[PDB]
Design a protein around this ligand. Structure first.
Ligand code: HEM
Ligand code: HEM
Ligand SMILES: Nc1ccc2ccc(CNCCCc3cncc(F)c3)cc2n1
Ligand SMILES: Nc1ccc2ccc(CNCCCc3cncc(F)c3)cc2n1
Ligand SMILES: C[C@H](O)[C@H](O)[C@H]1CNc2nc(N)[nH]c(=O)c2N1
Ligand SMILES: C[C@H](O)[C@H](O)[C@H]1CNc2nc(N)[nH]c(=O)c2N1
Ligand SMILES: [Zn+2]
Lengths: 411, 407
């Protein structure tokens, strides 16, 4: 079965065969589309074909499919599964797996970079202190004084689901949020619940608007432990505007390194529940979502006031106007401080070329339009006009439940 | 089987039961989502009639009534005899309002019950069609106080006697391909503008020439008609801050009147059912004005603003896009032509969703189309999970008639 996608701006038509390799379910049926829904202990029984599928992919990629090395490896894994009920990935397979999970991430606009990913093997890690050490090294390497480098650090895979390694933070670097008695929120409202946990765990909160959260790290299924990232490792950028000088006095800054730490990495049926990864920011992540979402820092009004816009009618588009200036400021501040960032025009144009390249070399590129299209200025980016096919390939990054809801407390 | 949708900005969760009524296919499968794809007999007919009449009669609290059963019986006999059937005026109006109600891609559906339905099933000629359309246009325009309307021409019979309006909208601007290689006017309509000229039209060859109607009655060849200019309300576009904006020479028409869709009610097909509401500002300022394959004016506007167009990172395109859209709203408001901004309209749609979930058990919605083409996440719909599914009665796309027409 062949499937066609059309760019309605260029009339470029692409053919997808890659979707045939898809196994996992989408959430959709012939009767309903769940394309806009945010989120729609494994036996030896199910595990071997998953290993086999992966190793078949891996060995094809290296042009050794059906080789003796291929065959012996399958043999080795089968035996190791039935003997030990799981198996260990070679370093080569781990690196291949991590890169392909990123490559397969249909919601990621930055995938043109997928083959440049620094993989840190942390499978020899046993304690939370060991995790802190690995994470510091990741942050230092990835930050690279502003010249960001994509990286991922991979802790030991799940075994019985009772000894999971987990990073309790959603991102390695993130600002605290504090609910006040008056109902107002100080800092990042997105992080109130997690901040509360940290505090309960013993964190002494400065209670400021931009307090970098401590790391809450769980090794081998034990209770999580608190650590503070050395501040000298946390690269931050003061936000100013190139024309508006009052903008600095808004008191805004952000961190340079976006590093998602709550996802699960699946490779050949193995589950890596702690696999923090990092790239660099697209400007709108901060300027549109982090700053301007009503449920986040929500600075639209204060900015618009300071710009003296007509705020009595939405049809003045005062919100749209303030939104643009803020995003200009975010990009200006990062570029000025030589911290890697990409605007949403550059990023989406790159994605289209990547996607076209993927269709030719790979036979497809799964993509989630709802997520690929930037949260401002949608149709003046080329992805808006691009038809996309969303489907699930493995290796993959998956959501997992927040550890505080599942964790069995030792005390 | 009972689905939940969540708004992530408000944490409001709605439960959808309405989707279980759905009958037509989405194009998606368990293995692949096609949510961003633009286009995914007697025995056939009675269950369709029946499904429709059941909902009609349920809607008026007469489910399982004699009148219900009688009507079911009557239509059943008429199909058996005639191989088709005719809708009662009441059913036609209900059906049209509900096709709109069910249009999962329409953000303006809070207005769905206030639709003026013009029954043009007695029409036999293109001149007749012209007359009805002029009347529609005048009524809907209402000197700038726009009112939603649909005019419904005779239903398909054997596919050989189709009523079709060839224009994609009642009112649209011409598109000419220059020797210069460029495109003057609206590039979207270059092909249609040709077919007009091929049929006899005389183009002023301007940037903004109101296209003539090409009307097909009873399967016959289509004929040209010029809409009386006095019926076409247009808005010259100015900016409430930039005095130079007027010199761009931009204008747009007030009446968005889609004419190429197919209205399906109770299995019956209305191939000619032009309808109109009023504009959301971004349709014109973002899509019509700033799409690359359209009027594509971003560059010229940016220059006039003297922005640093060297690097994408100055967000000069974004800056201009806003101002352009400010001007569109400003112009329509100034001249008292109905228009709604994307903030007001999406806020309205959230309220409408609430109502539909509460009173109907759900509201089919296509997020990809509902979220405006600018400033997406500062409108509430971006944060709103939506379920997309197909209910009938419906508006459907249909082939362009020149690819079909047996001349
Ligand atoms: C190098 C620069 C990168 C850029 C500019 C970029 C850009 C983005 C953006 C804007 C999103 C949407 C996230 C949101 O709005 O919440 C996203 C999602 C995602 N990215 Fe990338 N990314 C980059 C690197 C990476 C890397 C290194 C990985 C993993 C190895 C990755 C994996 C993912 C995944 C799994 C998602 C989906 C997240 C979710 O569903 O919550 N990305 N990316
Ligand atoms: C009265 C104010 C109305 C507003 C503000 C409005 C708004 C919109 C917008 C912005 C779109 C997206 C169209 C595009 O981007 O091309 C749309 C689509 C649509 N509208 Fe509405 N509309 C209104 C009235 C109506 C009426 C009266 C009908 C029919 C009786 C209707 C039926 C539809 C349908 C079927 C679509 C999907 C069209 C397609 O799939 O191409 N709308 N609407
Ligand atoms: N620049 C980058 C690179 C990779 C990224 C990978 C992931 C992300 C953020 N994903 C956040 C999802 C937040 C969320 C909140 N509520 C419900 C959800 F399902 C998801 C941002 C990224 N930014
Ligand atoms: N303000 C309104 C009201 C109702 C509307 C109903 C429909 C429309 C426009 N739909 C046209 C879609 C254009 C298109 C072009 N190529 C392929 C497509 F599937 C669709 C605009 C409306 N605007
Ligand atoms: C309801 C909807 O799916 C949700 O708001 C999505 C929309 N698209 C998105 N796109 C990106 N990149 N990130 C997001 O968080 C979201 N949120
Ligand atoms: C490729 C994609 O499906 C296409 O560009 C869609 C996106 N969303 C849209 N949304 C609206 N309202 N109108 C459109 O024409 C489109 N086009
Ligand atoms: Zn789908």
């Amino acid at each position: 079965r062949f499937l066609k996608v059309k760019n309605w701006e260029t009339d470029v038509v692409l053919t997808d065969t890659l979707h045939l390799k898809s196994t996992l379910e989408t959430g959709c049926t012939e009767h309903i589309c769940m394309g806009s829904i945010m989120l729609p202990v494994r036996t030896k029984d199910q595990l071997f074909p998953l290993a086999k599928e992966f190793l078949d992919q891996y060995y094809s990629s290296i042009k050794r499919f059906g080789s003796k090395a291929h065959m012996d490896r399958l043999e080795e894994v089968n035996k190791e599964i039935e003997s030990t009920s799981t198996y260990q990935l070679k370093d080569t397979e781990l690196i291949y797996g991590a890169k392909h999970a990123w490559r397969n991430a249909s919601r990621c606009v930055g995938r043109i970079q997928w083959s440049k990913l620094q993989v840190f093997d942390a499978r020899d890690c046993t304690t939370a202190h060991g995790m802190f050490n690995y994470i510091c090294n990741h942050v230092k390497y990835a930050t690279n004084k502003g010249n960001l480098r994509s990286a991922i650090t991979i802790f030991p895979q799940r075994t019985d689901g009772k000894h999971d390694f987990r990073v309790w933070n959603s991102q390695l670097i993130r600002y605290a949020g504090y609910k006040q008695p008056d109902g107002s929120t100080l800092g990042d409202p997105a992080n109130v619940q997690f901040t509360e946990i940290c505090i309960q765990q013993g964190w002494k909160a400065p209670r400021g608007r931009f307090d970098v959260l401590p790391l809450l790290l769980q090794a081998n299924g034990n209770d999580p432990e608190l650590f503070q990232i050395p501040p000298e490792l946390v690269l931050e950028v003061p936000i100013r505007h190139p024309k508006f000088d009052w903008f600095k006095d808004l008191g805004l800054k952000w961190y340079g390194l976006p590093a998602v730490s709550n996802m699960l990495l699946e490779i050949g049926g193995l589950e890596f529940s702690a696999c923090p990864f990092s790239g660099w920011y697209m400007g709108t992540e901060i300027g549109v979502r982090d700053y301007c979402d009503n449920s986040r820092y929500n600075i639209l009004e204060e900015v618009a006031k300071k710009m003296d816009l007509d705020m009595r009618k939405t049809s003045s588009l005062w919100k749209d106007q303030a939104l643009v200036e803020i995003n200009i400021a975010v990009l200006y501040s990062f570029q000025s401080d030589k911290v890697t960032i990409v605007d949403h025009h550059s990023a989406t144009e790159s994605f289209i070329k990547h996607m076209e390249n993927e269709y030719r070399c790979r036979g497809g590129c799964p993509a989630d339009w709802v997520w690929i299209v930037p949260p401002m200025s949608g149709s003046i980016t080329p992805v808006f006009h691009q038809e996309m096919l969303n489907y699930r390939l493995t290796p993959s990054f998956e959501y997992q439940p927040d550890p505080w809801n599942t964790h069995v407390w030792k005390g």
